[PDB]
Design a protein around this ligand. Structure first.
Ligand SMILES: CC(=O)n1cc(-c2c(C)[nH][nH]c2=O)c2ccccc21
Length: 112
């Protein structure tokens, strides 16, 4: 795939996640376990991922192939599902972002 064409294809799905308010707010920066008061976080979550890390990777040609991008998005959600209780605000927000991403990524990958 062409970098600019791969970037262009996937772009709208990322922007879809950013457009969700307030659901995208806990996902815009890397989790800071000190600030958030969750000192066990890095013991439980061994490979953190967030929107800003994805965007920087996308925009700088780090994704040579779509599933690399998809795997990073999926990791972000699975991290939050793993760490947070199912009744928590962040967990509910996560499911919302995940539902949105599936409905966006299907028609994209059904062409690339
Ligand atoms: C992604 C993730 O697991 N988390 C995100 C937050 C968070 C809140 C509630 N406000 N701003 C944030 O970044 C968070 C808080 C506690 C545990 C996990 C959290």
């Amino acid at each position: 795939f062409k970098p600019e064409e791969l970037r262009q294809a996937l772009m709208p799905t990322l922007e879809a996640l950013y457009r969700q308010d307030p659901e995208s707010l806990p996902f815009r920066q890397p989790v800071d376990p000190q600030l958030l008061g969750i000192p066990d976080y890095f013991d439980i979550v061994k490979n953190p991922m967030d929107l800003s890390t994805i965007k920087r990777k996308l925009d700088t040609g780090q994704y040579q192939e779509p599933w690399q991008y998809v795997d990073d998005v999926w990791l972000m959600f699975n991290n939050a599902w793993l760490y947070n209780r199912k009744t928590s605000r962040v967990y509910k927000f996560c499911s919302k972002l995940a539902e949105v991403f599936e409905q966006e990524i299907d028609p994209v990958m059904q062409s690339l």
